[PDB]
mmCIF file of C-alpha atoms in Angstrom:
data_model
loop_
_atom_site.group_PDB
_atom_site.id
_atom_site.type_symbol
_atom_site.label_atom_id
_atom_site.label_comp_id
_atom_site.label_asym_id
_atom_site.label_seq_id
_atom_site.Cartn_x
_atom_site.Cartn_y
_atom_site.Cartn_z
ATOM 1 C CA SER A 1 126.617 112.323 86.975
ATOM 2 C CA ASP A 2 127.182 108.683 85.950
ATOM 3 C CA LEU A 3 126.187 106.223 88.670
ATOM 4 C CA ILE A 4 123.718 105.142 91.367
ATOM 5 C CA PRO A 5 124.937 105.403 94.997
ATOM 6 C CA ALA A 6 125.988 102.059 96.508
ATOM 7 C CA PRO A 7 123.241 100.811 98.897
ATOM 8 C CA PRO A 8 124.050 100.258 102.600
ATOM 9 C CA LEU A 9 125.113 96.729 103.609
ATOM 10 C CA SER A 10 121.810 96.522 105.515
ATOM 11 C CA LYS A 11 120.004 96.411 102.132
ATOM 12 C CA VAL A 12 122.248 93.449 101.210
ATOM 13 C CA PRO A 13 121.444 90.107 102.924
ATOM 14 C CA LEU A 14 123.895 87.224 103.427
ATOM 15 C CA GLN A 15 123.384 83.503 102.791
ATOM 16 C CA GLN A 16 122.923 82.135 106.314
ATOM 17 C CA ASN A 17 125.352 79.340 107.246
ATOM 18 C CA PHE A 18 127.356 79.611 104.016
ATOM 19 C CA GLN A 19 128.935 76.335 102.881
ATOM 20 C CA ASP A 20 132.395 76.657 101.321
ATOM 21 C CA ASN A 21 132.848 73.288 99.611
ATOM 22 C CA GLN A 22 129.358 73.373 97.997
ATOM 23 C CA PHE A 23 129.609 76.837 96.379
ATOM 24 C CA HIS A 24 132.885 75.604 94.886
ATOM 25 C CA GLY A 25 132.979 74.911 91.176
ATOM 26 C CA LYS A 26 131.734 76.533 87.989
ATOM 27 C CA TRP A 27 129.048 79.226 87.762
ATOM 28 C CA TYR A 28 127.824 80.797 84.536
ATOM 29 C CA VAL A 29 127.210 84.541 84.487
ATOM 30 C CA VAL A 30 123.605 84.543 83.278
ATOM 31 C CA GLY A 31 122.712 88.023 84.605
ATOM 32 C CA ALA A 32 124.353 91.305 85.656
ATOM 33 C CA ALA A 33 123.055 94.556 87.160
ATOM 34 C CA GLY A 34 125.374 97.452 88.063
ATOM 35 C CA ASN A 35 125.410 101.216 88.674
ATOM 36 C CA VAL A 36 128.015 101.554 85.921
ATOM 37 C CA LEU A 37 126.240 101.583 82.546
ATOM 38 C CA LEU A 38 127.473 100.140 79.236
ATOM 39 C CA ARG A 39 128.801 101.133 75.809
ATOM 40 C CA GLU A 40 126.101 99.084 74.027
ATOM 41 C CA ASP A 41 128.709 98.586 71.261
ATOM 42 C CA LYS A 42 127.829 95.616 69.020
ATOM 43 C CA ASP A 43 124.871 95.279 71.466
ATOM 44 C CA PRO A 44 125.123 91.716 72.864
ATOM 45 C CA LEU A 45 127.360 90.956 75.847
ATOM 46 C CA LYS A 46 128.664 87.378 75.716
ATOM 47 C CA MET A 47 128.124 84.983 78.612
ATOM 48 C CA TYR A 48 131.132 84.026 80.751
ATOM 49 C CA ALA A 49 131.960 81.417 83.415
ATOM 50 C CA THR A 50 133.604 81.759 86.837
ATOM 51 C CA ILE A 51 135.269 78.802 88.574
ATOM 52 C CA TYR A 52 135.502 79.053 92.364
ATOM 53 C CA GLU A 53 138.283 76.779 93.615
ATOM 54 C CA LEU A 54 138.470 76.376 97.389
ATOM 55 C CA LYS A 55 141.981 76.258 98.899
ATOM 56 C CA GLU A 56 143.156 75.024 102.328
ATOM 57 C CA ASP A 57 143.299 78.563 103.762
ATOM 58 C CA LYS A 58 139.584 79.048 102.935
ATOM 59 C CA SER A 59 140.292 81.537 100.131
ATOM 60 C CA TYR A 60 138.989 80.999 96.602
ATOM 61 C CA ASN A 61 141.140 80.701 93.519
ATOM 62 C CA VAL A 62 138.791 82.450 91.076
ATOM 63 C CA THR A 63 139.255 81.732 87.353
ATOM 64 C CA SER A 64 136.903 83.498 84.909
ATOM 65 C CA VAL A 65 136.544 82.145 81.363
ATOM 66 C CA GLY A 66 135.455 84.502 78.587
ATOM 67 C CA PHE A 67 135.602 84.754 74.810
ATOM 68 C CA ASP A 68 136.721 87.800 72.781
ATOM 69 C CA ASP A 69 138.738 88.613 69.628
ATOM 70 C CA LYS A 70 139.083 84.942 68.587
ATOM 71 C CA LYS A 71 140.625 84.320 72.023
ATOM 72 C CA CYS A 72 139.681 82.531 75.241
ATOM 73 C CA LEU A 73 140.318 84.890 78.162
ATOM 74 C CA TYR A 74 141.393 83.757 81.633
ATOM 75 C CA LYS A 75 141.153 86.069 84.659
ATOM 76 C CA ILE A 76 142.768 84.578 87.776
ATOM 77 C CA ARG A 77 142.681 86.141 91.255
ATOM 78 C CA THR A 78 142.054 85.349 94.916
ATOM 79 C CA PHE A 79 139.041 85.943 97.136
ATOM 80 C CA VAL A 80 140.102 86.291 100.756
ATOM 81 C CA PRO A 81 137.482 85.340 103.409
ATOM 82 C CA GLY A 82 135.822 88.445 104.886
ATOM 83 C CA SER A 83 134.162 89.224 108.221
ATOM 84 C CA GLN A 84 131.271 86.776 107.907
ATOM 85 C CA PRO A 85 131.101 83.386 106.158
ATOM 86 C CA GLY A 86 129.824 84.084 102.630
ATOM 87 C CA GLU A 87 131.723 87.372 102.491
ATOM 88 C CA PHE A 88 134.972 87.836 100.621
ATOM 89 C CA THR A 89 137.539 90.550 100.069
ATOM 90 C CA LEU A 90 139.969 90.984 97.188
ATOM 91 C CA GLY A 91 143.568 90.705 98.383
ATOM 92 C CA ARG A 92 147.070 90.739 96.855
ATOM 93 C CA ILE A 93 146.086 94.027 95.165
ATOM 94 C CA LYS A 94 149.302 95.996 94.605
ATOM 95 C CA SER A 95 151.793 96.955 91.837
ATOM 96 C CA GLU A 96 149.722 98.223 88.867
ATOM 97 C CA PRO A 97 148.169 101.524 90.084
ATOM 98 C CA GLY A 98 144.580 101.573 91.343
ATOM 99 C CA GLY A 99 144.083 100.445 94.937
ATOM 100 C CA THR A 100 140.631 98.990 94.342
ATOM 101 C CA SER A 101 139.415 97.086 97.402
ATOM 102 C CA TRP A 102 136.475 94.840 96.496
ATOM 103 C CA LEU A 103 133.741 93.588 98.774
ATOM 104 C CA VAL A 104 132.099 90.258 97.921
ATOM 105 C CA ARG A 105 128.975 88.873 99.590
ATOM 106 C CA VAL A 106 126.911 85.771 98.741
ATOM 107 C CA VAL A 107 123.254 86.824 99.140
ATOM 108 C CA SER A 108 121.543 83.578 98.121
ATOM 109 C CA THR A 109 122.358 80.218 96.549
ATOM 110 C CA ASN A 110 121.123 76.696 95.870
ATOM 111 C CA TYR A 111 124.694 75.385 95.648
ATOM 112 C CA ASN A 112 123.064 73.091 93.063
ATOM 113 C CA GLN A 113 121.344 75.569 90.735
ATOM 114 C CA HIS A 114 121.391 79.333 91.361
ATOM 115 C CA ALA A 115 123.331 81.998 93.240
ATOM 116 C CA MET A 116 123.121 85.810 93.571
ATOM 117 C CA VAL A 117 126.328 87.626 94.612
ATOM 118 C CA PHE A 118 126.803 91.298 95.578
ATOM 119 C CA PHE A 119 129.998 93.164 94.599
ATOM 120 C CA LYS A 120 131.169 96.519 95.974
ATOM 121 C CA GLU A 121 134.148 98.685 95.061
ATOM 122 C CA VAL A 122 135.846 101.240 97.315
ATOM 123 C CA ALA A 123 138.180 103.541 95.354
ATOM 124 C CA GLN A 124 138.078 107.379 95.249
ATOM 125 C CA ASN A 125 134.819 108.610 96.877
ATOM 126 C CA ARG A 126 132.379 107.299 94.212
ATOM 127 C CA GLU A 127 131.625 103.582 94.474
ATOM 128 C CA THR A 128 130.883 101.071 91.713
ATOM 129 C CA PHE A 129 128.748 98.026 92.528
ATOM 130 C CA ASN A 130 127.074 95.167 90.677
ATOM 131 C CA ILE A 131 124.939 92.132 91.449
ATOM 132 C CA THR A 132 125.823 88.944 89.563
ATOM 133 C CA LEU A 133 123.359 86.183 88.752
ATOM 134 C CA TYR A 134 125.034 82.776 88.756
ATOM 135 C CA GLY A 135 123.676 79.481 87.492
ATOM 136 C CA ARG A 136 125.123 75.998 87.227
ATOM 137 C CA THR A 137 123.645 75.881 83.731
ATOM 138 C CA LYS A 138 123.101 78.646 81.153
ATOM 139 C CA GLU A 139 119.285 78.421 81.205
ATOM 140 C CA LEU A 140 117.357 81.446 82.490
ATOM 141 C CA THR A 141 113.757 81.039 83.631
ATOM 142 C CA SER A 142 111.346 83.975 83.694
ATOM 143 C CA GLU A 143 111.005 83.190 87.414
ATOM 144 C CA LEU A 144 114.761 83.542 88.021
ATOM 145 C CA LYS A 145 114.771 86.609 85.730
ATOM 146 C CA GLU A 146 111.918 88.351 87.621
ATOM 147 C CA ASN A 147 113.477 87.427 90.977
ATOM 148 C CA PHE A 148 116.764 89.045 89.938
ATOM 149 C CA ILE A 149 115.138 92.156 88.414
ATOM 150 C CA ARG A 150 113.128 92.800 91.600
ATOM 151 C CA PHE A 151 116.254 92.277 93.739
ATOM 152 C CA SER A 152 118.125 94.736 91.515
ATOM 153 C CA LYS A 153 115.342 97.339 91.763
ATOM 154 C CA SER A 154 115.258 97.039 95.584
ATOM 155 C CA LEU A 155 118.940 98.070 95.472
ATOM 156 C CA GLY A 156 117.951 101.105 93.391
ATOM 157 C CA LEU A 157 118.812 99.885 89.907
ATOM 158 C CA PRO A 158 116.627 100.685 86.854
ATOM 159 C CA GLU A 159 115.517 98.088 84.282
ATOM 160 C CA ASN A 160 118.076 99.371 81.728
ATOM 161 C CA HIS A 161 120.915 98.780 84.216
ATOM 162 C CA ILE A 162 120.267 95.035 84.188
ATOM 163 C CA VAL A 163 121.956 92.804 81.575
ATOM 164 C CA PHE A 164 121.237 89.171 80.632
ATOM 165 C CA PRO A 165 124.200 87.978 78.517
ATOM 166 C CA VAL A 166 123.642 85.865 75.401
ATOM 167 C CA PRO A 167 124.848 82.254 75.935
ATOM 168 C CA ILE A 168 127.861 81.069 73.927
ATOM 169 C CA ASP A 169 129.390 77.748 72.899
ATOM 170 C CA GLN A 170 133.043 78.768 73.008
ATOM 171 C CA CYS A 171 135.701 78.745 75.769
ATOM 172 C CA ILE A 172 133.199 78.741 78.650
ATOM 173 C CA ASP A 173 132.352 75.025 78.520
ATOM 174 C CA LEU B 1 134.682 94.540 78.398
ATOM 175 C CA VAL B 2 134.299 90.758 78.490
ATOM 176 C CA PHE B 3 134.357 90.420 82.266
ATOM 177 C CA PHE B 4 131.608 92.982 82.774
ATOM 178 C CA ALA B 5 130.499 91.821 86.245
ATOM 179 C CA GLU B 6 131.985 90.761 89.631
ATOM 180 C CA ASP B 7 135.319 92.374 90.546
ATOM 181 C CA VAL B 8 135.257 94.589 87.450
ATOM 182 C CA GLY B 9 138.426 96.018 85.920
ATOM 183 C CA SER B 10 141.070 94.443 88.171
ATOM 184 C CA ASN B 11 144.514 94.188 86.487
#
């Protein structure tokens, strides 16, 4: 009808012995694959950054920097530690209608260079999910590309459901 | 969308 079924959590590995204070900091969104498709309006999706800030209570203050309409956009929220280290939930979700509970899981990371992070939504029977490719820089090697594509496909996503955003020199640096 | 990945849509 619109989307690919969200794969079981078994299909989604977790970074063994996840290290809080080393995943902290800025990650560029250099790749994105999701079951929800796009508008393809204009055609290129701009690159954006996400700053993970570790707090005392082990939650992350998550600030995302984007650029659109001659404006720098800032999206601030909290990632609450989930059942296993490397897993997060989205809390404080109330008020504005749409009880969307998010599931966050760190699959793999260098801490120093790359990370791949799984995202799952639960809201009204049909579930939206995406995998995000993070890098400490904006560079994208064919090796990292191919790695990500194959990981996407193993979760049931087609080639055309995978996006590699064009790098920008505005807001995100 | 500008924040097309991660916890999409929120707020």
